[PDB]
Amino acid sequence: AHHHHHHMRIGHGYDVHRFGEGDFITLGGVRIPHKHGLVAHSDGDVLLHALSDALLGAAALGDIGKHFPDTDPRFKGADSRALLRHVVAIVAEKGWKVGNVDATIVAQAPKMAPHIETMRGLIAEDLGVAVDQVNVKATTTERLGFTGREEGIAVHAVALLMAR
Amino acid sequence: HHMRIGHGYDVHRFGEGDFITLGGVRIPHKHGLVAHSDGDVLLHALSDALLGAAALGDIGKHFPDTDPRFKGADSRALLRHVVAIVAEKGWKVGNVDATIVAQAPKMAPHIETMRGLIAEDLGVAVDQVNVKATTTERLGFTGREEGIAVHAVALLMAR
Amino acid sequence: HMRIGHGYDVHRFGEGDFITLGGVRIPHKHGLVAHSDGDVLLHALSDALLGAAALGDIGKHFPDTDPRFKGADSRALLRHVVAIVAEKGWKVGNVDATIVAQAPKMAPHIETMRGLIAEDLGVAVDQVNVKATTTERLGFTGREEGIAVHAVALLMAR
Ligand SMILES: Nc1ccn([C@@H]2O[C@H](COP(=O)(O)O)[C@@H](O)[C@H]2O)c(=O)n1
Ligand SMILES: Nc1ccn([C@@H]2O[C@H](COP(=O)(O)O)[C@@H](O)[C@H]2O)c(=O)n1
Ligand SMILES: Nc1ccn([C@@H]2O[C@H](COP(=O)(O)O)[C@@H](O)[C@H]2O)c(=O)n1
Ligand SMILES: [Mg+2]
Ligand SMILES: [Mg+2]
Ligand SMILES: [Mg+2]
């Protein structure tokens, strides 16, 4: 008796990748044509990485690197949707499911708007939730800072977890 | 008892003008803020935190800068609309917390005024609203006084 | 009932041979410039707690104009924040923080930070998350001009 119930947890992820050569970027599982790619060991999906770290952070499980180190061949080159699904499983094992997530793509270019709803659908599938539990938005910094100078893209993500 | 989290981040550049508007307060200043609306970075970030928590997108979806009807819009009115459509979806405000990231002007004399206006627009008590301000120690675009940034977070509760 | 808060703090590097983060002394080619001991991480956590509780920010409670707090241990400042948040009726549910720094390497120090933070917050270690990341040499953190921290907190009614 007298156990904890209906507990909730907050997490926040902030990720950055710099532009490099390529013909597209990948955000939220969606390939977006662009004259640069993002520099990364795999697909450079800044949005899914930030969401992953928000989930792990809420669960006090560290960050992606703690669970998928580069020394581990299993996850070498892994698709970031597959990584996110593995994060969801780890967090579930610890007793937590997703209540909702909200994320902000900080990018001067390309435009994110036409891709947002597709991202929401894929993220919701990977998180095991309804689309109404997932929000993605975007903003520029009005040509200020490293995102404004088109040097890279940043994402802020927050997550609220609920006890399973 | 269900709840939702949201986060908003907004930036506006300085431009010509004699005041800025933050949290509904007009602060005399050497520059204004450039924006389609009145440029209230703080109310924009709060609006996006609320829309984000309710999975309703962002303020640019609801009040596009391609629509001249929203030119110079009072961001308090935009925020009140956000509160209304969040309520329609079944949520009210639990609490909000925001950080103004600005090298200048000093926000301190205006914080409590901002809290009262924000609480009124959100339909909550002043104790459910926190506003704070910080500098970046003259680093980065806010430190060079190129613009102002705001981070806001919101927790929604079931109506 | 629960409450959300967020803190963001930045300090610039200055001449020195260590920094203090999460209560831990980390050797470095520079120090951090600050009125206090410069612990960006504890400052951001303090502001997330105060923000959630609608108690303002840490400068309201420990003004930089007061010489008595010059060089102050940011853990002691945090312990006071925890006490006044409790007096208002709130305790910590969990916190999550991100150190944004190109250097020094934070990884060897994180578990030590979590232990000190959890003690100061009056919670278990499994209620405290700290992670570190770079901006891939972009921006003022990428140019090694300073360190930033983002922290979020969820408070629970006492
Ligand atoms: N890279 C970006 C940046 C912003 N946007 C969208 O543009 C609108 C206005 O953004 P700004 O306020 O940054 O101009 C928002 O609705 C935002 O989601 C976008 O679709 N792609
Ligand atoms: N633009 C700003 C920036 C900070 N401040 C206040 O100054 C104090 C210290 O902030 P800094 O250490 O960032 O200078 C804080 O309490 C903050 O509320 C302000 O009143 N206006
Ligand atoms: N200042 C820093 C930045 C990152 N890190 C470590 O580097 C890992 C990967 O971070 P980046 O992707 O930012 O390089 C983190 O999970 C953390 O263990 C660190 O230990 N100190
Ligand atoms: Mg990444
Ligand atoms: Mg705006
Ligand atoms: Mg500080």
**Which CATH number goes with the domain that contains C8?**
3.30.1330.50
Question: A44, A17 in Cβ contact below 8 A?
Answer: yes
Alpha-carbon gap: B59 to the closest alpha carbon of chain C (Å) = 21
For an interface test with A, the pick among C45, C129, C143 (most A C-beta atoms closer than 10 Å) comes out as C129
Distance between CA atoms of residues C32 and C20, nearest Å: 8
Q: Is the Cβ–Cβ distance between C154 and B5 less than 8 Å?
A: no
Residue showing tokens 């969401």: A51
In C30-136, beta strands by DSSP E? 30-32, 90-100, 128-133
Residue in the block written with tokens 């705001």 = B150
Report the C-alpha gap between C118 and C140 in whole angstroms.
30
Burial C103-119 (b: 16+ CB within 10 A, else e): ebebeebbeebbebbbe
Distance from chain centroid for Cα B139? 23
Q: Helix B75-88 vs helix B111-122: angle between axes, to the nearest 10 degrees?
A: 40
Torsion of the alpha carbons at A32, A35, A41 and A47, rounded to the nearest 10: -40
**C91 part of contact set with chain A, CB < 8 Å:** no
Tell the residue nearest (CA) to atom 10 of ligand 3: C133
Q: Are strands A30-33 and A134-139 parallel, antiparallel or unpaired?
A: unpaired
Contact A105, A141 (CB under 8 A): no
Could you tell me which of A124, A109, A132, A141 has the C-alpha nearest to residue A48?
A124
B11: left (phi > 0), else alpha (psi -120 to 50), else beta?
A: beta
CA dihedral B21, B26, B27, B33 (to 10 degrees): 30
- Considering only CA atoms, which residue is closest to atom 14 of ligand 1? A140
Q: How far is the CA of B130 from the centre of ligand 5 (A)?
A: 19
Residues 37-66 on A with a CB inside 8 Å of C are 39, 53-54, 56-63
Cβ-defined contact of C136 to A152 (cutoff 8 Å): yes
CA distance B109 to B101: 16
Crossing angle of the two packed helices C74-87 and C110-121, in degrees rounded to 10: 40
Residue type, B14: F
Whether residue A151 lies within 8 A of chain C, CB to CB, comes out as yes
Best of A139, A149, A151 to mutate (most B CBs within 10 Å, chain B): A139
Q: What does each C-alpha distance from C18 to B158, C77, C105 come to in angstroms?
A: 48, 20, 12
Q: How far apart are CA C90 and CA A28, in angstroms?
A: 36
Q: Is A7 exposed, middle or buried (0-12, 13-18, 19+ CB in 10 A)?
A: middle
Q: Are A158 and B6 in contact (CB under 8 A)?
A: yes
**B113–C contact, CB cutoff 8 A:** no
Can you give the residue range of the structural domain that contains A20?
1-164
In angstroms, the CA B152 to CA B138 distance is: 21
- Which residues are found with C-beta within 5 Å of the ion, ligand 5? B 10, 44
Place of tokens 């790619």: A37
> Looking at residue A164, what DSSP letter applies?
-
> What length is written for chain B?
159
Tokens (6 digits) for B142: 């806010």
Question: Do the chains contact at C9 and B134, CB–CB below 8 Å?
Answer: yes
Q: Are C1 and C19 in contact (CB under 8 A)?
A: no
Residue C135 annotated in ligand binding: yes
Nearest Cα neighbor of B81 from B43, B132, B113, B27 is B43
Residue nearest to atom 16 of ligand 2 (CA): C59
Give the pairing type, strands B91-101 and B129-134: parallel
Dihedral angle over CA of B33, B35, B41, B46, nearest 10: 170
Of C3, C8, C50, nearest to B151 by CB-CB distance is C8
Q: Determined by which method?
A: X-ray
Q: Which residue(s) pair with B158 in the sheet?
A: B91
* Strand extents, DSSP E, chain A: 8-21, 24-27, 30-33, 36-38, 96-106, 134-139, 152-163
Indicate the helix (H) or strand (E) that contains B43: helix B41-53
Residues of A in contact with C94 (CB under 8 A): 9-10, 58, 60
Which of B3, B5, B89 to mutate to probe the A interface, most A CBs <10 Å? Answer: B5
Residue pair A70/A76 in contact by the 8 Å Cβ criterion: yes
The response to whether residue B94 sits with its C-beta less than 6 Å from ligand 1 reads: no
Tokens of C153: 């907190």
What is the C-alpha separation between B61 and C48, in angstroms, rounded? 29
- CB B3, CB A99: distance < 8 Å: yes
Nearest to A28 by CA among A16, A6, A43, A41: A43
B13, containing H or E segment: strand B3-15
Do residues A155 and A106 lie in contact, with contact meaning Cβ atoms separated by under 8 Å?
Answer: yes
Alpha-carbon gap, residue C20 to B151, rounded angstroms? 25
DSSP E strand stretches across chain C: 2-15, 18-21, 24-27, 30-32, 90-100, 128-133, 146-157
Q: What resolution in angstroms, rounded to 1 decimal? A: 1.5
The alpha-carbon gap from B44 to the nearest alpha carbon of chain A, in Å, equals 11
Number of domains chain B is built from: 1
Which residue from B47, B159, B63, B148 is spatially nearest to B96, judged by alpha carbons?
Answer: B47
Residue A140 in contact with ligand 1 by CB distance below 6 A:
yes
CB of C47 closer than 8 Å to CB of B99: yes
Cα–Cα distance, C125 to A118 (Å, whole number): 38
Shortest CB distance from B13 goes to which of A106, A131, A142?
A142
Cα(B27) to ligand 6 centroid in Å equals 25
CA distances C13 to B149, C16, C33, Å, are 22, 8, 6
Pocket probe mutation, ligand 3, options C133, C136, C138, C144, max atoms within 8 Å of Cβ: C133
Cβ–Cβ < 8 Å for B105, B29: yes
Q: Are C36 and C74 in contact (CB under 8 A)?
A: yes
